[PDB]
Write a protein that holds these residues in place. Structure first.
Motif, PDB file in Angstrom:
ATOM      1  N   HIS B   1       0.807  -1.219   0.000  1.00 14.08           N
ATOM      2  CA  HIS B   1       0.000   0.000   0.000  1.00 14.08           C
ATOM      3  C   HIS B   1       0.850   1.283   0.000  1.00 14.08           C
ATOM      4  CE1 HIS B   1       1.148  -0.041   4.096  1.00 14.08           C
ATOM      5  NE2 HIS B   1       0.235   0.809   4.531  1.00 14.08           N
ATOM      6  N   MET B   2       1.109   1.836   1.184  1.00 12.83           N
ATOM      7  CA  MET B   2       1.815   3.112   1.327  1.00 12.83           C
ATOM      8  C   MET B   2       3.300   3.056   0.964  1.00 12.83           C
ATOM      9  SD  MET B   2       2.468   5.258   4.832  1.00 12.83           S
ATOM     10  CE  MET B   2       4.128   5.797   5.230  1.00 12.83           C
ATOM     11  N   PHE B   3       3.840   1.850   0.892  1.00  9.42           N
ATOM     12  CA  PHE B   3       5.209   1.666   0.439  1.00  9.42           C
ATOM     13  C   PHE B   3       5.218   1.113  -0.977  1.00  9.42           C
ATOM     14  CE2 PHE B   3       6.393   1.322   5.065  1.00  9.42           C
ATOM     15  CZ  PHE B   3       7.063   2.523   5.073  1.00  9.42           C
ATOM     16  N   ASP B   4       4.053   0.658  -1.441  1.00 13.14           N
ATOM     17  CA  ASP B   4       3.911   0.204  -2.816  1.00 13.14           C
ATOM     18  C   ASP B   4       4.888   1.011  -3.675  1.00 13.14           C
ATOM     19  OD1 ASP B   4       1.911  -1.764  -2.362  1.00 13.14           O
ATOM     20  OD2 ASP B   4       0.264  -0.426  -2.850  1.00 13.14           O
ATOM     21  N   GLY B   5       6.018   0.396  -4.035  1.00 14.28           N
ATOM     22  CA  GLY B   5       7.023   1.035  -4.869  1.00 14.28           C
ATOM     23  C   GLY B   5       8.235   1.641  -4.174  1.00 14.28           C
ATOM     24  N   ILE B   6       8.785   0.941  -3.187  1.00 12.35           N
ATOM     25  CA  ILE B   6       9.974   1.415  -2.481  1.00 12.35           C
ATOM     26  C   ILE B   6      10.715   0.245  -1.857  1.00 12.35           C
ATOM     27  CG2 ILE B   6      10.785   2.562  -0.381  1.00 12.35           C
ATOM     28  CD1 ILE B   6       9.150   4.867  -0.871  1.00 12.35           C
ATOM     29  N   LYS B  72       0.587   7.239  14.081  1.00  5.25           N
ATOM     30  CA  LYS B  72       1.758   7.340  14.928  1.00  5.25           C
ATOM     31  C   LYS B  72       2.833   6.433  14.340  1.00  5.25           C
ATOM     32  CE  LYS B  72       2.684   7.434  19.950  1.00  5.25           C
ATOM     33  NZ  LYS B  72       3.312   6.119  20.235  1.00  5.25           N
ATOM     34  N   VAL B  73       2.425   5.207  14.018  1.00  3.08           N
ATOM     35  CA  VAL B  73       3.377   4.197  13.557  1.00  3.08           C
ATOM     36  C   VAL B  73       3.836   4.418  12.117  1.00  3.08           C
ATOM     37  CG1 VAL B  73       1.593   2.586  12.843  1.00  3.08           C
ATOM     38  CG2 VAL B  73       3.891   1.775  13.287  1.00  3.08           C
ATOM     39  N   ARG B  74       2.896   4.737  11.233  1.00  2.00           N
ATOM     40  CA  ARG B  74       3.254   5.084   9.870  1.00  2.00           C
ATOM     41  C   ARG B  74       4.343   6.150   9.886  1.00  2.00           C
ATOM     42  NH1 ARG B  74      -1.885   5.890   7.597  1.00  2.00           N
ATOM     43  NH2 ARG B  74      -0.865   7.284   6.077  1.00  2.00           N
ATOM     44  N   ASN B  75       4.182   7.155  10.739  1.00  7.21           N
ATOM     45  CA  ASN B  75       5.166   8.225  10.843  1.00  7.21           C
ATOM     46  C   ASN B  75       6.494   7.737  11.427  1.00  7.21           C
ATOM     47  OD1 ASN B  75       6.182  10.671  12.877  1.00  7.21           O
ATOM     48  ND2 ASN B  75       5.713  11.347  10.791  1.00  7.21           N
ATOM     49  N   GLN B  76       6.436   6.773  12.346  1.00  8.46           N
ATOM     50  CA  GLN B  76       7.678   6.178  12.847  1.00  8.46           C
ATOM     51  C   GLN B  76       8.445   5.547  11.683  1.00  8.46           C
ATOM     52  OE1 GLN B  76       6.826   5.519  17.378  1.00  8.46           O
ATOM     53  NE2 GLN B  76       8.124   6.870  16.118  1.00  8.46           N
ATOM     54  N   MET B  77       7.701   4.818  10.860  1.00  6.69           N
ATOM     55  CA  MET B  77       8.259   4.117   9.711  1.00  6.69           C
ATOM     56  C   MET B  77       8.846   5.097   8.719  1.00  6.69           C
ATOM     57  SD  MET B  77       5.341   1.209   9.020  1.00  6.69           S
ATOM     58  CE  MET B  77       4.900   0.046  10.310  1.00  6.69           C
ATOM     59  N   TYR B  78       8.079   6.127   8.394  1.00  7.71           N
ATOM     60  CA  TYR B  78       8.575   7.155   7.498  1.00  7.71           C
ATOM     61  C   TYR B  78       9.908   7.669   8.037  1.00  7.71           C
ATOM     62  CZ  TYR B  78       9.134  11.779   5.433  1.00  7.71           C
ATOM     63  OH  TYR B  78       9.643  12.910   4.833  1.00  7.71           O
ATOM     64  N   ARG B  79       9.951   7.988   9.323  1.00  4.73           N
ATOM     65  CA  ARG B  79      11.214   8.390   9.909  1.00  4.73           C
ATOM     66  C   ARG B  79      12.330   7.408   9.539  1.00  4.73           C
ATOM     67  NH1 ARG B  79      12.255  11.032   8.784  1.00  4.73           N
ATOM     68  NH2 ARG B  79      14.012  11.640  10.126  1.00  4.73           N
ATOM     69  N   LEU B  80      12.102   6.114   9.744  1.00  2.00           N
ATOM     70  CA  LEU B  80      13.156   5.132   9.429  1.00  2.00           C
ATOM     71  C   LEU B  80      13.760   5.266   8.018  1.00  2.00           C
ATOM     72  CD1 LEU B  80      12.179   1.749  11.133  1.00  2.00           C
ATOM     73  CD2 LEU B  80      13.246   3.811  12.077  1.00  2.00           C
ATOM     74  N   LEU B  81      13.040   5.908   7.105  1.00  2.00           N
ATOM     75  CA  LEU B  81      13.473   5.978   5.715  1.00  2.00           C
ATOM     76  C   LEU B  81      14.699   6.864   5.476  1.00  2.00           C
ATOM     77  CD1 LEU B  81      10.152   5.966   3.587  1.00  2.00           C
ATOM     78  CD2 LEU B  81      11.747   4.107   4.015  1.00  2.00           C
ATOM     79  N   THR B  82      15.283   6.719   4.293  1.00  2.00           N
ATOM     80  CA  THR B  82      16.403   7.546   3.882  1.00  2.00           C
ATOM     81  C   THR B  82      15.891   8.610   2.938  1.00  2.00           C
ATOM     82  OG1 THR B  82      16.877   6.128   1.964  1.00  2.00           O
ATOM     83  CG2 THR B  82      18.038   5.641   4.023  1.00  2.00           C
ATOM     84  N   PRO B  83      16.558   9.764   2.923  1.00  2.00           N
ATOM     85  CA  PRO B  83      16.247  10.875   2.018  1.00  2.00           C
ATOM     86  C   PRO B  83      15.778  10.402   0.644  1.00  2.00           C
ATOM     87  CG  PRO B  83      18.197  11.400   3.263  1.00  2.00           C
ATOM     88  CD  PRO B  83      17.724  10.057   3.774  1.00  2.00           C
ATOM     89  N   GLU B  84      16.566   9.550  -0.007  1.00  2.00           N
ATOM     90  CA  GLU B  84      16.194   9.024  -1.319  1.00  2.00           C
ATOM     91  C   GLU B  84      14.799   8.417  -1.255  1.00  2.00           C
ATOM     92  OE1 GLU B  84      18.979   6.035  -2.482  1.00  2.00           O
ATOM     93  OE2 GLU B  84      20.485   7.499  -3.140  1.00  2.00           O
ATOM     94  N   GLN B  85      14.690   7.372  -0.443  1.00  2.00           N
ATOM     95  CA  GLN B  85      13.449   6.637  -0.283  1.00  2.00           C
ATOM     96  C   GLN B  85      12.287   7.583  -0.013  1.00  2.00           C
ATOM     97  OE1 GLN B  85      14.916   4.098   3.027  1.00  2.00           O
ATOM     98  NE2 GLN B  85      14.729   2.391   1.579  1.00  2.00           N
ATOM     99  N   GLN B  86      12.491   8.546   0.875  1.00  2.00           N
ATOM    100  CA  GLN B  86      11.440   9.498   1.193  1.00  2.00           C
ATOM    101  C   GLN B  86      10.999  10.256  -0.056  1.00  2.00           C
ATOM    102  OE1 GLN B  86      13.184  11.651   4.438  1.00  2.00           O
ATOM    103  NE2 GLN B  86      12.604  10.121   5.979  1.00  2.00           N
ATOM    104  N   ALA B  87      11.962  10.637  -0.891  1.00  2.00           N
ATOM    105  CA  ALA B  87      11.623  11.268  -2.170  1.00  2.00           C
ATOM    106  C   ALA B  87      10.815  10.334  -3.095  1.00  2.00           C
ATOM    107  CB  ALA B  87      12.875  11.789  -2.866  1.00  2.00           C
ATOM    108  N   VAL B  88      11.241   9.080  -3.218  1.00  2.00           N
ATOM    109  CA  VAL B  88      10.471   8.116  -3.999  1.00  2.00           C
ATOM    110  C   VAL B  88       9.030   8.054  -3.489  1.00  2.00           C
ATOM    111  CG1 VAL B  88      10.303   5.754  -4.833  1.00  2.00           C
ATOM    112  CG2 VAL B  88      12.544   6.731  -4.327  1.00  2.00           C
ATOM    113  N   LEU B  89       8.898   7.969  -2.177  1.00  2.00           N
ATOM    114  CA  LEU B  89       7.599   7.995  -1.543  1.00  2.00           C
ATOM    115  C   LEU B  89       6.826   9.221  -2.011  1.00  2.00           C
ATOM    116  CD1 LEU B  89       6.971   7.379   2.252  1.00  2.00           C
ATOM    117  CD2 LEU B  89       5.416   8.593   0.720  1.00  2.00           C
ATOM    118  N   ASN B  90       7.477  10.380  -2.080  1.00  2.00           N
ATOM    119  CA  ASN B  90       6.758  11.553  -2.575  1.00  2.00           C
ATOM    120  C   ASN B  90       6.282  11.366  -4.011  1.00  2.00           C
ATOM    121  OD1 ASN B  90       5.717  14.065  -3.364  1.00  2.00           O
ATOM    122  ND2 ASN B  90       7.022  15.151  -1.885  1.00  2.00           N
ATOM    123  N   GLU B  91       7.113  10.718  -4.830  1.00  2.00           N
ATOM    124  CA  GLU B  91       6.719  10.378  -6.195  1.00  2.00           C
ATOM    125  C   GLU B  91       5.413   9.581  -6.167  1.00  2.00           C
ATOM    126  OE1 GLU B  91       9.895   8.436  -8.377  1.00  2.00           O
ATOM    127  OE2 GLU B  91      10.893  10.322  -8.889  1.00  2.00           O
TER     128      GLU B  91
END
Ligand code: ZN
Ligand code: ZN
Ligand code: ZN
Ligand code: ZN
Ligand code: ZN
Ligand code: ZN
Ligand code: ZN
Ligand code: ZN
Ligand code: ZN
Lengths: 112, 108
Positions: B1-6, B72-91
């Motif tokens: 779902h929310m990571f679909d593609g990372i 709360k948890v989704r945001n914890q997970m997002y935190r765990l991400l790396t700059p790159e990955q976070q950008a892909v997520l924005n895509e």
């Protein structure tokens, strides 16, 4: 979300299916059609550097306080569909329901 | 779902699954009771609008707590991400948003 398969294991004369489907999609109507808005702001909150719990709670409570109407309407429809059934069909319904409940409890205990 | 593609190291993949289990922990269980009295209402010979309202709300509370803990948890997970990955997520987020919008005016 629709109870369907709500009439699973149940059937249900053809005129009964007519009267059912008409209008059971009225129950597909006034379902929850999310905003690009709710979604965008939700996203912004969830993606934030530091988390604003009170904000997200606020947004949740709004969303819910909203849905309540639908909830009630679709409950009305459901009740109608129920009334359109024979006490035995009903029996089978209440059995399915009770099963579902037990399952839910088992899951509660397991996750306790 | 929310990571679909990372993707997404194994170490952090396990971090996220761990967090997911412990989240199915911190979150409220399905109140099967309210569900009971609800079904009960919905299946009565005569229909009490207000009663049903009362129950809808009474359940709403758990609904909210769920949404908040899940965020709360989704945001914890997002935190765990790396700059790159976070950008892909924005895509992906923006794609999703396009599909949604372009559709929310269809067919118009
Ligand atoms: Zn956005
Ligand atoms: Zn998002
Ligand atoms: Zn809304
Ligand atoms: Zn059991
Ligand atoms: Zn525990
Ligand atoms: Zn019951
Ligand atoms: Zn029910
Ligand atoms: Zn409750
Ligand atoms: Zn908490």
């Amino acid at each position: 979300s629709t109870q369907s398969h709500m009439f699973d294991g149940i059937s249900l004369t053809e005129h009964q299916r007519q009267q059912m489907r008409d209008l059971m999609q009225q129950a597909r109507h006034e379902q929850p059609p999310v905003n690009v808005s709710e979604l965008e702001t939700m996203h912004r909150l969830v993606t934030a550097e530091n988390f604003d719990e009170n904000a997200v709670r606020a947004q949740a409570e709004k969303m819910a306080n909203e849905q309540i109407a639908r909830q009630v309407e679709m409950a009305k429809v459901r009740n109608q569909m129920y009334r359109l059934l024979t006490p035995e069909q009903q029996a089978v319904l209440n059995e399915k329901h009770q099963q579902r409940m037990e399952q839910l409890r088992d899951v509660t205990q397991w996750q306790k």
